[PDB]
Ligand binder design. Structure first.
Ligand SMILES: CCCCCCCCCCCCCCCCCC(=O)OC[C@H](COP(=O)([O-])OCC(O)COP(=O)([O-])OC[C@@H](COC(=O)CCCCCCCCCCCCCCCCC)OC(=O)CCCCCCCCCCCCCCCCC)OC(=O)CCCCCCCCCCCCCCCCC
Ligand SMILES: CCCCCCCCCCCCCCCCCC(=O)OC[C@H](COP(=O)([O-])OCC(O)COP(=O)([O-])OC[C@@H](COC(=O)CCCCCCCCCCCCCCCCC)OC(=O)CCCCCCCCCCCCCCCCC)OC(=O)CCCCCCCCCCCCCCCCC
Ligand SMILES: CCCCCCCCCCCCCCCCCC(=O)OC[C@H](COP(=O)([O-])OCC(O)COP(=O)([O-])OC[C@@H](COC(=O)CCCCCCCCCCCCCCCCC)OC(=O)CCCCCCCCCCCCCCCCC)OC(=O)CCCCCCCCCCCCCCCCC
Ligand SMILES: CCCCCCCCCCCCCCCCCC(=O)OC[C@H](COP(=O)([O-])OCC(O)COP(=O)([O-])OC[C@@H](COC(=O)CCCCCCCCCCCCCCCCC)OC(=O)CCCCCCCCCCCCCCCCC)OC(=O)CCCCCCCCCCCCCCCCC
Ligand SMILES: CCCCCCCCCCCCCCCCCC(=O)OC[C@H](COP(=O)([O-])OCC(O)COP(=O)([O-])OC[C@@H](COC(=O)CCCCCCCCCCCCCCCCC)OC(=O)CCCCCCCCCCCCCCCCC)OC(=O)CCCCCCCCCCCCCCCCC
Ligand SMILES: COC1=C(OC)C(=O)C(C/C=C(\C)CC/C=C(\C)CC/C=C(\C)CC/C=C(\C)CC/C=C(\C)CC/C=C(\C)CC/C=C(\C)CCC=C(C)C)=C(C)C1=O
Ligand code: HEM
Ligand code: HEM
Lengths: 176, 95, 454, 354, 326
């Protein structure tokens, strides 16, 4: 049987790379060719194209946030699961101000108005969600590894759920 | 659905969305009952047709004999009309 | 796939079980243990199966009356003597095996052999004792006085084994219980309690030679043998339903579904033990460290998610083995409205053994099977049950090392082969009590033993 | 919608005691699908400017086009046979007594089917087709300027065919939608049983009822294939293979067999409008058969004498339609109409107490 | 409840149940429901052996009158009057509903009213003979009827699974064959029809043509020039066969004609589709007058706006004096 031979090859290979250091954790020296490219192309490209374009986009983004009176981390959409899991655990004082800022922004945007300049002198790029995003990613990675390492077989279209993995009832068209 | 008393459920587990109709036909069995059966894979699957054959047809025919008199009267009407039609045609046309 | 040997040096460090056959044919088995307490008993090959339809229930009646006095002693004297030794006489009777053992201190090992021999060989089956026990047995026989687990256990045998004596219940029908008399019991003792069918098991601070010398002295006058049992065909497994639909007993429904299993000595028995461990057991009221929603057991995990409530208030697998047949299945206790999901999920789980069983689930199950088995051998009575049951079932006691050696060979592929041969597209029996509107017909449930996918 | 399918096919419960007469509805649903499919395919080749030459072209030039032509014609006969038998079935067991909403949903499909079948017959574009629609349309000549708007000319022409074709193409699709309202009410308002009362013996549909329903539909297919390929029963009048002549009438002007009952009613009554109204009466009067009853009973499982006389009355009226307009037939037909009225009054009237 | 209706009305012709009961109006009254006899423990009537010996029934066949379909029943929906007829419980008539509440039948002489009204609870009335007539089934399968205990196969039987799956497999086997035949046949109808396939093949009878003559055959909607070529015409194209690569579309006459004497080409100018006229131009070949394209005796473009050579259709020679286009 060829599947048995293939299974042994996979087992032996994976056993031979256990404990390997990830590529990013290796101390890597650039090749003599990438160093030349960085010496010539990268400086000129930054001065003439990348630097000005990205400053132009960044400064516009800061202005847009300041006009709405929101922070950058407010702009995250909770349809993303990491954001939703992080928002479950944020403390109440952070939550209250986040909601108020987001509500004011939508009112301003909907009515085509901008925040008064008196209230615009703040840094919008303060990363207040970072501790909770990292905790949420850790929780999700543990669940991924210890509980979702195989494609599981379940009885199909039973109890309001397709049986293909989703956990909410009536959350697909074929489960109406 | 059945009566409200019949479909009143004892358990608090919610009715699955795919069994709505199944649980609207629930019955409240009074006094209990013992149900027994055997898988068709361990039974004769055609003998019951033969065993029940004569009684099935006897009771079918005795019930259908109730329509004997009505059918004869309608048939008697069918014959009179058919031969009343022939005589009329001949009288009006034949010489 | 083979992942190595799990046998350890500690598994080999256990005192040997010495089994010798006395001239009369009685086997004497002993294991020494560094304990201050011992267990000595007689595990006899007898039970309801070997009773005839008219006499069914005699064995159970005899077991209850055996300790109620002997020809030499009296009930008060016997009970007083055992108490003075600080011991307690126990006994049980099953479909195929019976036991009469005593838990005692070290000094009471040999005295207890005498008491147990006197009870077994010279029972004084006084009429007054019989009549009082008739009242107690009659009350026990009532279904209202039985648990629903006990009822289903008997009804599974009644439904599965309609053609043979394994279908008979141990307690017996009420008609027989009403008519049993001393003569019935005297005949059963003479025919069934013979040396060739008895094993004297002693576990504790015991010496094999001394136990053997006492056994030969006290069981000298036992009947050496009885005629060989009738030769019979393989018990026929009847795929049937026996469901007691009662909507006046509350919300919980009890269901048991059975497949044909394997005999004790089958090469596949250990595979069926492992499959029983993979099915596992779950209780909403004792979930354990891991919640159902995050369980490694696939049946448990999918069940806990159903309708955001869970479709299993309780379930357990069962693997019952007899000399020439066995039963393998699961028992469920669940809400009335959950029965269709529960039976469907536990049948989908058994069908999965034939198609998609992961190495991870097998390896977890091997460890929890070993933990259950080894922990059962902790006390002397646990060891004694193991020695006696095994010698009757196999003629020898399998060592912990041998059990692990054979279990090492079993893998996901072996489980798949055995399940494909025996459980896939197989016939099933369903039994039930309680509100069972949700339970479908046997044929509908029998179609869940195979998959359209794969 | 896989959980809706599972709730109405897989875990749908029905009584075990039903007969094969409960399989008729399933047969209607399946043959209806076939009629829609074969119609769509036939229109890939059909010529609406001359229906007479289109049929010839399909039968001779298209590969296996004869199968499409004969299936569509013969399956229409089967649709009416099965539907009428379903109506007779419902009348016999008086399923309308409590499941009136099911009866109402069904009658709508009956009304639509009548229009569908008639216009389709016209699309053949033969002698009977032209003269049949000419006669029927004159019934509404009383309403001013209504005939001109419907026909699109002063006589039936291809202009009329073009517009009737659109109704024939679309109305059957609406009929399929009404079949969903019919099945919705059947599944909510549980079906009747051969016994009057409601009993606890239901089994799931997919594993038991569907197997039995397939056995019935395969048995009907063995009969339909014999008719389809060999024409063991004359179910299409031959006069529709004659080219249309607007100046000469055919020997007789009659519809398909399944319209004969209504055709005779008109031919019998002297006044044209009275004939139309009696046609209206027969279909509408059976919608209120149980409405005036006052007793706790569904009149079920008696000797059903009135029922049997009514079924034979339909058969005899169908027989009179085939015959020429002989005076003697007219007299007897009128007696049958009077007799039918008395039977319906027996159904409607509640009983007094001795 | 779902939309529902009852005929609880005041009829103009039919009396209410209180006025005229339709049931046998003889009931036995107790003081407490426990005083009723137990049907299960009550002896029934002695069994008969002939259907003609069965007992008589208490029902009145003619309980109802007037026009309408025959029916026997005991109950109706009609409304009662606020002052209903007083029932004769002394004789056994049933007292339940309005005839109890809106009457004084319940009143005894010296009994406390609470005790008197307690007796007229509906549970205290049972029809005379209830315990001796009502059936008390012990099973749904009477003795003598077939059941699983009679149809079970012998224990030495053979497996019935293999044949069962053969039967259900055969249903699928035949069904799939009918399905494939239906699908293929329907798709087949879209192939060009018998009239069209027939018209798409024209046979050229090269018999009667003269060297140098050009004739036109309408083939699949297009003009197909079929010209017999004189030796001069053939030699002319052969001469240009050497100057190939000096032509807009280099092609050799050998690769455009199957037989040198016969040139079959589609007569459609490659510029804008106009049909060229033969024996015209500078090469005596085919000149399209629309915009001035000149083709040679092999049909190759030699001058004008046209970009390519006139196409050679698919055609074979059936014999020496017949071609088949297509
Ligand atoms: C770069 C580094 C170096 C590279 C080196 C590469 C090394 C590989 C190459 C060398 C391979 C050697 C293989 C040795 C084979 C050994 C054979 C042998 O001894 O048998 C033991 C061997 C295994 O026995 P076993 O130990 O019991 O194990 C059972 C399992 O099969 C065991 O299998 P499994 O469990 O492992 O499962 C996998 C299974 C199954 O694996 C798969 O099938 C893979 C499926 C993957 C998905 C594929 C999707 C489709 C993709 C199509 C792509 C097309 C692209 C086209 C591009 C065009 C433009 C460029 O694989 C096999 O069955 C093995 C196949 C062996 C070779 C024979 C078949 C090859 C394919 C032939 C196709 C011919 C097409 C012709 C077309 C003509 C057109 C006009 O026997 C077989 O099972 C082999 C046969 C398998 C069936 C093949 C088809 C047979 C057809 C019979 C027709 C009969 C007609 C009768 C008519 C009667 C009329 C009356
Ligand atoms: C020159 C000649 C050349 C010739 C060349 C010939 C070549 C032949 C090619 C043949 C086809 C090869 C296709 C390969 C695709 C590979 C994709 C891949 O990498 O997948 C990894 C990917 C895993 O992704 P992941 O991110 O790691 O985890 C996924 C989950 O997020 C989380 O994953 P999880 O594992 O945690 O979740 C658990 C659950 C996860 O479950 C799923 O992921 C299922 C997802 C939903 C599936 C259902 C979708 C709804 C229905 C769509 C169709 C609607 C209309 C159908 C009817 C129309 C009638 C008019 O897993 C299971 O349940 C395991 C068992 C699954 C099998 C159950 C069997 C019963 C159900 C039958 C349906 C499924 C069959 C297997 C898939 C077939 C793929 C083709 O798995 C899938 O893609 C799952 C299957 C979904 C696609 C189904 C498509 C069905 C066919 C539709 C028609 C297609 C026509 C277009 C052309 C077809 C030809 C190419
Ligand atoms: C170089 C050459 C290149 C060639 C290019 C072409 C390549 C060939 C292949 C192209 C087609 C690819 C098909 C992909 C299949 C994917 C299957 C899948 O995963 O589905 C679930 C998946 C959902 O993912 P999920 O949420 O992860 O799944 C988990 C849930 O369980 C999922 O469950 P869920 O419920 O959430 O989602 C299910 C979803 C799945 O459905 C879809 O999303 C649509 C999938 C099918 C697409 C349509 C296929 C059409 C092609 C076949 C027809 C060709 C005819 C040709 C004839 C020629 C004749 C001459 O929705 C449905 O199932 C809707 C079903 C509605 C049915 C309604 C039917 C009517 C009512 C009932 C019957 C009538 C009443 C009764 C009457 C009775 C009378 C009496 O679907 C999608 O997300 C994808 C949808 C498709 C997107 C577009 C795909 C583009 C493909 C790339 C190539 C495009 C090239 C350009 C084409 C230009 C054309 C003009
Ligand atoms: C120049 C000519 C000009 C002509 C101008 C004509 C203008 C006419 C204007 C008419 C306006 C529209 C009227 C519509 C009324 C709608 C009422 C309604 O829906 O009420 C529901 C309403 C619902 O009440 P509920 O409380 O829910 O239920 C009541 C319970 O069921 C139980 O209730 P209960 O127990 O209290 O009983 C009450 C009792 C109360 O009953 C009565 O008072 C009604 C009595 C009606 C007697 C009619 C006898 C006609 C005899 C003609 C004899 C001709 C002799 C010629 C002699 C020639 C000598 C040379 O009802 C019954 O006993 C049962 C009633 C059954 C009704 C069946 C309905 C069938 C209608 C269709 C019949 C015809 C179709 C077939 C034939 C067509 C072709 C010919 O029903 C009632 O309250 C009962 C009303 C029943 C009315 C029936 C009226 C029938 C009239 C037939 C006329 C025939 C004329 C023939 C002339 C021949 C000349 C030669
Ligand atoms: C919703 C309601 C329902 C709606 C429904 C729809 C309604 C719509 C409206 C209606 C529309 C109008 C139309 C209605 C039509 C209705 C009527 C209709 O459909 O009629 C159709 C049709 C009417 O007849 P017909 O269509 O005129 O007949 C056509 C012909 O009969 C047969 O056809 P044919 O002649 O055209 O074709 C014949 C041909 C057809 O030929 C084929 O198809 C065969 C060829 C298939 C080849 C497959 C190859 C697959 C593998 C490819 C390679 C894969 C490589 C992959 C590698 C992967 C690697 C990674 O087959 C043969 O010639 C047979 C021999 C085949 C030999 C094959 C040998 C294979 C050799 C392979 C060698 C390979 C080696 C390679 C090695 C090297 C490799 C490198 O109906 C029937 O005939 C009914 C038949 C029913 C079944 C009858 C059988 C009953 C059996 C009873 C058994 C029980 C009794 C047991 C007795 C036991 C005694 C003890
Ligand atoms: C002369 O010989 C004779 C015959 O043979 C010729 C006979 O057949 C007969 C009997 C014949 C019959 C009983 C039937 C005759 C049938 C005829 C004349 C059909 C004529 C054509 C029509 C009525 C087509 C017009 C179609 C309709 C009005 C639709 C019919 C269906 C209806 C009304 C049911 C519910 C309504 C619908 C389904 C319409 C839906 C509407 C929409 C979807 C519109 C939506 C619009 C918007 C803006 C959203 C007799 C008596 C006879 O004498
Ligand atoms: C219950 C549905 C239908 C029935 C009762 C029915 C009935 C019929 C009748 C009786 C014929 C004429 C038979 C003959 O030529 O003598 C006909 C013709 C035709 N029908 Fe239908 N039809 C239905 C549905 C449809 C549908 C859905 C379509 C198109 C999508 C369609 C398209 C046609 C066409 C094109 C013709 C002309 C072919 C002919 O001469 O038979 N029909 N129809
Ligand atoms: C397009 C035509 C129709 C189709 C598709 C159809 C289909 C169905 C089906 C599937 C059933 C359920 C199963 C059955 O009882 O056989 C049924 C039930 C029923 N139908 Fe129809 N039907 C049609 C026409 C009609 C008509 C014209 C009437 C009334 C005159 C009618 C009245 C009923 C009734 C009363 C029932 C209830 C059956 C019962 O209670 O047992 N149907 N039909």
């Amino acid at each position: 049987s060829f599947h048995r031979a293939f299974a042994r090859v996979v087992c032996n290979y994976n056993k031979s790379i256990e404990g390997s250091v990830p590529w990013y954790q290796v101390k890597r020296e650039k090749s003599p060719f990438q160093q030349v490219w960085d010496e010539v192309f990268t400086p000129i490209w930054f001065k003439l194209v990348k630097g000005p374009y990205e400053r132009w986009e960044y400064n516009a983004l800061v202005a847009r946030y300041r006009g709405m009176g929101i922070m950058a981390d407010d702009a995250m959409n909770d349809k993303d699961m990491i954001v939703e899991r992080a928002l479950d655990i944020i403390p109440e004082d952070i939550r209250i101000q986040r909601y108020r800022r987001m509500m004011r922004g939508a009112v301003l945007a909907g009515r085509k108005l901008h925040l008064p300049l008196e209230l615009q002198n703040y840094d919008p790029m303060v990363p207040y969600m970072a501790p909770y995003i990292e905790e949420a990613k850790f929780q999700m990675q543990e669940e991924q590894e210890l509980l979702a390492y195989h494609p599981w077989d379940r009885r199909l279209y039973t109890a309001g759920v397709s049986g293909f993995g989703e956990t909410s009832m009536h959350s697909t068209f074929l489960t109406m | 659905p059945n009566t409200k008393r019949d479909i009143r459920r004892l358990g608090s587990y919610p009715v699955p969305p795919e069994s709505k109709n199944f649980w609207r036909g629930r019955f409240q069995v009074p006094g209990g009952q013992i149900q027994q059966g055997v898988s068709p894979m361990q039974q004769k699957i055609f003998f019951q047709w033969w065993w029940n054959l004569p009684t099935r047809y006897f009771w079918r025919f005795t019930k259908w004999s109730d329509f004997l008199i009505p059918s004869l009267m309608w048939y008697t009407g069918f014959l009179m009309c058919k031969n009343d039609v022939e005589e009329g045609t001949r009288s009006r046309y034949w010489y | 796939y083979y992942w190595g040997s799990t046998v350890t040096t500690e598994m080999h460090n256990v005192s040997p079980t010495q089994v010798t056959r006395l001239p009369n044919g009685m086997r004497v088995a002993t294991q020494f243990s560094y304990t201050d307490s011992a267990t000595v008993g007689l595990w006899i090959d007898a039970g309801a199966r070997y009773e005839t339809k008219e006499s069914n229930g005699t064995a159970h009646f005899l077991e209850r009356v055996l300790y109620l006095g002997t020809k030499n002693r009296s009930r008060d004297q016997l009970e007083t003597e055992v108490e003075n030794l600080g011991a307690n006489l126990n006994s049980y009777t099953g479909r195929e095996q019976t036991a009469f053992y005593a838990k005692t201190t070290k000094d009471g090992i040999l005295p207890c052999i005498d008491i147990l021999a006197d009870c077994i060989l010279n029972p004084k089956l006084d009429g007054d004792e019989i009549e009082k026990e008739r009242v107690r047995i009659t009350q026990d026989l009532q279904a209202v006085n039985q648990s629903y687990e006990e009822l289903l256990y008997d009804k599974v045998h009644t439904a599965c084994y309609r053609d043979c004596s394994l279908g008979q219940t141990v307690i017996g029908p009420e008609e027989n219980v009403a008519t049993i008399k001393r003569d019935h019991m005297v005949n059963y003792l003479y025919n069934n309690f013979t040396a060739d069918r008895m094993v004297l098991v002693a576990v504790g601070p015991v010496d094999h030679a001394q136990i053997v010398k006492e056994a030969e002295k006290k069981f000298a006058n036992i009947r050496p043998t009885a005629g060989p049992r009738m030769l019979e065909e393989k018990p026929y497994f009847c795929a049937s339903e026996l469901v007691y639909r009662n909507d006046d007993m509350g919300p919980t429904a009890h269901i048991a579904i059975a497949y044909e299993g394997v005999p004790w000595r089958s090469p596949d028995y250990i595979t069926f033990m492992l499959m029983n461990a993979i099915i596992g057991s779950y209780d909403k009221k004792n979930e354990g460290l891991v919640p159902g929603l995050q369980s490694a057991n696939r049946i448990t995990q999918t069940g806990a998610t159903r309708m955001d409530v869970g479709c299993f208030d309780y379930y357990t697998g069962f693997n019952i083995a007899y000399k020439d047949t066995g039963l393998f299945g699961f028992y469920i206790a669940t809400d009335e409205v959950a029965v269709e999901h529960a039976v469907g999920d536990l049948m989908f789980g058994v069908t999965s053994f034939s198609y998609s069983l992961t190495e991870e689930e097998v390896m977890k199950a091997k460890r929890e099977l070993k933990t259950n088995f080894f922990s059962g051998l902790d006390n002397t009575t646990g060891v004694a049950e193991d020695i006696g049951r095994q010698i009757l079932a196999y003629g020898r006691r399998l060592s912990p090392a041998e059990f692990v050696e054979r279990l090492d060979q079993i893998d996901s592929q072996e489980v798949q082969r055995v399940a494909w041969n025996r459980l896939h597209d197989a016939e099933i029996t369903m039994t039930g009590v309680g509100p069972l509107h949700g339970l479908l017909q046997l044929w509908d449930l029998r179609r869940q033993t195979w998959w359209w996918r794969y | 919608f896989i959980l809706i399918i599972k709730d109405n096919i897989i875990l749908y419960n029905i009584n075990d005691s039903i007969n094969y007469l409960w399989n008729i509805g399933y047969i209607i649903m399946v043959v209806m699908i076939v009629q829609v499919i074969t119609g769509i395919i036939i229109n890939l080749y059909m010529n609406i400017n001359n229906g007479y030459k289109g049929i010839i072209y399909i039968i001779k030039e298209i590969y296996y086009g004869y199968i499409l032509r004969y299936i569509h014609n013969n399956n229409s006969t089967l649709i009416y046979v099965v539907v009428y038998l379903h109506i007779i079935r419902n009348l016999y067991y008086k399923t309308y007594y409590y499941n009136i909403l099911i009866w109402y949903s069904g009658m709508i499909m009956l009304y639509q089917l009548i229009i569908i079948g008639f216009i389709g017959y016209i699309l053949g574009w033969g002698q009977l087709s032209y003269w049949g629609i000419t006669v029927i349309i004159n019934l509404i000549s009383g309403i001013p300027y209504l005939i001109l708007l419907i026909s699109g000319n002063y006589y039936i022409t291809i202009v009329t065919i073009k517009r009737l074709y659109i109704v024939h193409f679309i109305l059957p699709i609406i009929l399929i939608y009404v079949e969903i309202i019919h099945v919705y009410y059947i599944h909510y308002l549980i079906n009747n049983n051969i016994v009057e009362y409601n009993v606890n013996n239901k089994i799931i549909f997919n594993n038991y009822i569907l197997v039995k329903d397939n056995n019935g539909i395969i048995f009907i297919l063995n009969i339909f294939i014999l008719e389809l390929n060999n024409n063991i029963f004359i179910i299409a009048d031959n006069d529709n293979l004659i080219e249309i002549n607007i100046l000469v009438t055919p020997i007789h002007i009659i519809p398909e067999w399944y319209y004969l009952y209504w055709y005779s009613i008109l031919k019998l009554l002297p006044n044209k409008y009275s004939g139309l109204y009696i046609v209206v009466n027969s279909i509408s009067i059976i919608n209120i058969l149980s409405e005036y009853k006052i007793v706790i009973s569904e009149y079920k499982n008696y000797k059903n004498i009135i029922w049997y006389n009514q079924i034979i009355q339909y058969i005899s009226m169908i027989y009179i339609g085939i015959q020429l307009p002989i005076i003697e037939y007219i007299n007897y037909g009128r007696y049958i109409i009077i007799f039918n009225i008395l039977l319906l009054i027996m159904y409607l009237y509640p009983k007094k107490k001795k | 409840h779902r939309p529902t209706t009852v005929k609880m009305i005041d009829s103009w012709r039919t009396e209410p149940s209180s006025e005229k009961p339709m049931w046998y109006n003889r009931f036995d009254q107790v003081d407490h429901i426990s005083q009723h006899p137990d049907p299960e423990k009550t002896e029934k009537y002695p069994p008969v052996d002939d259907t003609r010996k069965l007992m008589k029934t208490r029902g009145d066949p003619h309980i109802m009158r007037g026009w309408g379909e025959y029916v026997y029943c005991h109950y109706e929906h009609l409304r009662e009057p606020v002052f209903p007829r007083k029932p004769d419980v002394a004789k056994g008539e049933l007292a339940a509903g309005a005839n109890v509440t809106r009457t004084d039948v319940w009143k005894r002489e010296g009994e406390p009213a609470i005790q008197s009204i307690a007796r007229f609870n509906p549970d205290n009335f049972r029809p005379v003979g209830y315990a001796e007539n009502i059936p008390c089934p012990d099973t749904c399968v009477p003795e003598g009827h077939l059941d699983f205990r009679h149809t079970r196969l012998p224990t030495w039987h053979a497996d019935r699974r293999p044949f069962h799956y053969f039967a259900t497999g055969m249903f699928g086997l035949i069904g799939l064959a009918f399905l494939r035949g239906t699908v293929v046949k329907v798709v087949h109808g879209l192939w060009p029809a018998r009239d069209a396939i027939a018209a798409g093949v024209i046979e050229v009878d090269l018999r009667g043509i003269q060297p140098g003559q050009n004739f036109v055959v309408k083939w699949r909607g297009k003009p197909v020039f079929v010209r017999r070529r004189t030796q001069a015409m053939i030699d002319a194209a052969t001469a240009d066969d050497a100057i190939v690569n000096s032509l807009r579309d280099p092609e050799r006459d050998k690769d455009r004609v199957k037989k040198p004497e016969w040139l079959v080409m589609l007569g459609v100018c490659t510029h804008l589709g106009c049909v060229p006229y033969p024996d015209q131009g500078l090469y005596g070949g085919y000149f399209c007058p629309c915009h001035g394209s000149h083709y040679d005796h092999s049909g190759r473009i030699r001058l004008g706006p046209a970009p390519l050579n006139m196409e050679i259709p698919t055609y074979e020679f059936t014999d020496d004096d017949t071609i088949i286009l297509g």
